[PDB]
Enzyme design. Structure first.
Site, PDB file in Angstrom:
ATOM      1  N   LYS A   1     -17.077  -7.359   7.846  1.00 25.25           N
ATOM      2  CA  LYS A   1     -15.876  -8.044   7.461  1.00 25.25           C
ATOM      3  C   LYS A   1     -15.130  -8.486   8.634  1.00 25.25           C
ATOM      4  CE  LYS A   1     -13.804  -5.868   3.761  1.00 25.25           C
ATOM      5  NZ  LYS A   1     -14.850  -6.470   2.884  1.00 25.25           N
TER       6      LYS A   1
ATOM      7  N   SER B   1      -2.666  -7.703   2.824  1.00 28.78           N
ATOM      8  CA  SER B   1      -2.992  -7.622   4.266  1.00 28.78           C
ATOM      9  C   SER B   1      -3.376  -9.008   4.798  1.00 28.78           C
ATOM     10  CB  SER B   1      -4.103  -6.604   4.481  1.00 28.78           C
ATOM     11  OG  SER B   1      -3.623  -5.300   4.129  1.00 28.78           O
TER      12      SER B   1
ATOM     13  N   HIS C   1       0.827  -1.191   0.000  1.00 28.33           N
ATOM     14  CA  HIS C   1       0.000   0.000   0.000  1.00 28.33           C
ATOM     15  C   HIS C   1       0.869   1.251   0.000  1.00 28.33           C
ATOM     16  CE1 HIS C   1      -2.877  -2.734   2.243  1.00 28.33           C
ATOM     17  NE2 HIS C   1      -3.676  -2.255   1.327  1.00 28.33           N
TER      18      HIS C   1
ATOM     19  N   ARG D   1      -2.468  -6.959  -8.328  1.00 23.32           N
ATOM     20  CA  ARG D   1      -1.363  -7.915  -8.021  1.00 23.32           C
ATOM     21  C   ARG D   1      -1.388  -9.128  -8.902  1.00 23.32           C
ATOM     22  NH1 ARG D   1      -3.210  -8.900  -3.570  1.00 23.32           N
ATOM     23  NH2 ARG D   1      -2.334 -11.029  -3.568  1.00 23.32           N
TER      24      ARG D   1
END
Lengths: 163, 163, 171, 163, 171, 163
Positions: E51, E138, E27, E100
Site C-alpha cells: 500500500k 486518513s 479513529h 462513514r
C-alpha cells in the site's frame, strides 16, 4: 443583470432548525428568498397552511430579505409567476439527491429557464426533517433541540387537541 | 458587501460540454464565476495546467463574467483569497453527492464562512465525465459530441505526440 | 419481432465483458443464467490494460473454458479496445453486466448511456447475483488466495489449481 | 427450439414514454413480451385496470410480439403460469436497484426457475415516472412530451369528470 | 447455560483493524466509544503490504499509542496477513469497523460475509462516526497535509508533529 | 467492566429468521439482549403487541440471556430507563444505513450516552424483511423458509379469520 430571487419550496410541516439554517445561508447569497409553503394536496399535513406560514414567519422574520407565501399548483408555474432565478432545495441524503435530480430535469423540460440549486445541511442539522420531528413529537418526545420555540408550542397545542 | 463571486473548482482534464453547461448556468445566477483549475498534484493529469486553462478559456471566454485561474488545490485557502461567496460543484452521481457533502462539512469546519452550492447536470450531459472522455479518446473513439472543438483538436495533438 | 423465429437473424448474442482474473463461481452463475435466456453468450476477457492482471489472458481464457465449456452456447474470447467497437464487430444484441452493489449500478448506468451515444444500437442488460454469490469478487478472491486462504468454496476447481501453480512460481 | 417470454410487470398508472421505450427495447431481445398490469393492491391507481390496459394496448400494440394482461396475486405465481423466462424491470434510481435486488432473491427462493433482468432508461426518459406525470397532469401541467397521445386524452377525460 | 460474569471467558475482545496512516480524530472517537463497550480493544495496524503508506508501521503504532494510551483497555499491535486469521489467533469476539458513507457500508457488508464464509465464528460490528468527525479519513488528511493545509482540527497533536517532520524530510 | 445490556428495537411484525439470526449473534457478544417490540400505533401492525411478543419469545426463548418487552417507541427514553449500553440495529440495505446513521446522531444529541451498534445480515437472510413477508403471506405464498414455525402458524390463524 437583474437581482436574484430564489424560491425555497416545501410543506414546512412544521418548519425546523434545518429549514432555518438553509434559509439563513441562502439569504446571504441571494437578494430575495421566498419561503414557499405548498398547501400539500394529499400527503395531508398536520398543521394547516395558515399555521405553517405563521410558524415560518415567526422563525425567519428577522431576516429582512425573506418573504413567506402559500402556494398550490405546479412548482414550475410558481417559478415563472415569481420571476425566480432558481429554486433552492436542501439535500440531506442519497434519496433526496436522486429525487431532486429527477425533478430538476422534469421541471427544466417543462420550462427551459427553470433552475435548481442545492445546499447540504450543516452537520448539526443533518438528520432533521419535519417527518422525523413529527414522529418524535407524536410519541411525546421532546423536539426542543430541533425546532424553533413556536413550533414546540404548536406541538403542545396539537397534543391538547388529541393528536 | 453583496455582489456574488462563486468558485467552480476542478481539474478540467479536459473540460467537457458538461462543465460548459454548468458554468453557463452558474454565470446567469452569480455576478462573477471563477473557473478554478486545480493543478492536480496528486493526480497526473493528461493535459498540462496551461493546456487545461487554454481549453477552458476558449470554451467559455464568451461569457463575460467568467474568469480562469490555476490554483494549488487547497480549496479553503483559495476561497478566502478570492473573497468568494461560495464554491459551486456539479453532482453527477450518488458518489459525488457523498464526497462533496463531506468536503463541504470539512471546509466549513476550517472556515465558518465557507459555503458550497450544488447543481445537477441536465440529462443530456449527465453521462459525461472527463475521465471517461479521456479513456474513449485514448482508444481513438470519437469524443466530438461531448467536448468543445478545441478539446477534440487537443486530443489529436496528444495522439500525434505520445498517447 | 418481425424477423421469423426460425431465422439466424432472430437469434440473440450477448457479450459478457470483464477481466475474469480469475473467473469465480459468481461469474459462472451469471453466465449459466444468461445462457438460458440468450442464444449465444460471449465471455469477453478484457486484456486489462492497466490494473495488470495476476493471470495472463491465455490463462484466464483457459480457466473460463474449463469452467463453462459444458455450456454449448458459450464462447470465450480475448479483447482489447473499446467495448462499443467490440460490440459492433461481434454483432451483439446486448452487453450483459452483473450488478453487485450500488457503485456498480451507478457506473453501468452511466456507461450504458455513453455507449448508446457512441452507437445507437448499443444495449445493456443487467443481472443481480444470487445471494450465495453476492459477496464473491475476483479481487477479493485474489487477496485471500495470495495470503494462502482457502478459496475452494468460491471458485471452480481449475482456478484452485491455477492458484496453487501461482504459489509454486512465487506468486 | 425454446422461445423466450419475458414479463414486464407494473401498475402503469398511466403508461409513459419511459415504459414505451423499455418495452420497445425488450421486444428486440426476446421472442415475446408480456406487459403485465398489476391491479395495484392498495395505493389505488388513478386509472382503472381496464383504462390502464387500454392505454398500454394503444401505446404499444404496434409491436407485434407484445401482449397485454391484467393480473393480481403474487408475481412469482404469475411467472409460473405464464411459463416465463424472466421478469424485466427498469432501474431508474438506487432505491429501485436495492428493492429489485432483494425481490429477485426472494422470488428465486419462492421458485428456483425465477429470473429477473434489468434495463436502465435512456437519459431522455430517465426523469419520467407515472407518479410524477400524474401530479403534473392533476395541476393541469402539460404532459404531452412525456406520454403517448392516448394518455393525454385520458387525462383530459379525467379532468372533465372532476378528476 | 452461560459462563459466569466473573470469568475471563465472559470477557469481550474486539479488533479494530486499519492502516491508520495516520490515526485521526475519527479513529480516536471510535476507539473511545468501543472501549466503553468491550473489555479489550485491539488497535490492529495492518502493515499495508504494498500500500506504500506514508508513515512506517512503527510510526503508526507510536502515533496510535500516544493518541489512545490513556484508555487502559486498549492495545496497539501491527499485523499482516488475512484479517480472519488474525481474528482467530487473537481469540477475538468481533471486528469493529466504522461506517462513514454508503461505499463503506457496501464494502464492509461484503467483507463480513466473505470472512464469515472463511470462519463461521467471525463477527463484524459497526459504529457510525459522531457527526463532528463524519468526514474524516486518513486519505483525506494526507492530501490536505501534502498541500500544506492545516490538519490540526482533525488529528491528535502527535500526528500534527509527525506531519511537520515529514515535510522537513521533503514531503 | 460493567455488564453490557443491548436493546434490539423494532416492530417485529412478525419476527423473521433475519431477526432471529441477529439476536442470536448479539446474544453471543453482550451479557443481556432486550428484544424491544415497539407497539407501533400508527403504521398499524398486522399482529397485536401481545402476539408479536409471544412470537419473539417462542422463537428466541432458548437463548437464556434474551428478554422480550413491549415499549412505546420513544427509543432514547427507553434506552435510559433500561440502563442500556447500546442499541443494536441490523442494516440490510443502503436506505437502512442512511436512516440509522441519522437516527443515531439525533439520539446522541438527545442523550450523549446513547450508543448505536450495527450488524449486517448474513447473505442467506439479507433479502428477508417483515414487510415483504407479510405481503407474500397475504397473497398466500409460502413463507416457511423465512420465518419460525410459530410465525407460519400465526399467519394461518390470520387466514382462518379471512385475511
Amino acid at each position: 443583470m437583474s437581482k436574484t430571487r430564489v424560491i425555497y419550496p416545501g410543506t414546512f410541516d412544521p418548519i425546523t432548525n434545518g429549514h432555518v439554517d438553509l434559509v439563513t445561508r441562502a439569504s446571504r447569497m441571494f437578494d430575495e428568498v421566498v419561503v414557499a409553503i405548498a398547501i400539500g394536496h394529499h400527503k395531508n399535513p398536520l398543521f394547516s397552511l395558515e399555521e405553517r406560514v405563521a410558524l415560518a414567519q415567526s422563525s425567519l422574520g428577522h431576516l429582512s430579505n425573506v418573504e413567506f407565501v402559500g402556494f398550490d399548483g405546479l412548482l414550475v408555474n410558481f417559478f415563472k409567476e415569481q420571476k425566480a432565478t432558481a429554486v433552492l432545495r436542501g439535500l440531506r441524503a442519497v434519496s433526496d439527491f436522486e429525487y431532486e435530480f429527477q425533478l430538476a430535469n422534469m421541471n427544466r423540460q417543462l420550462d427551459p429557464h427553470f433552475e435548481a440549486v442545492f445546499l447540504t445541511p450543516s452537520e448539526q442539522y443533518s438528520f432533521i426533517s419535519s417527518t422525523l420531528i413529527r414522529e418524535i413529537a407524536r410519541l411525546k418526545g421532546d423536539v426542543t433541540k430541533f425546532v424553533p420555540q413556536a413550533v414546540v408550542e404548536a406541538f403542545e397545542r396539537k397534543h391538547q387537541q388529541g393528536w
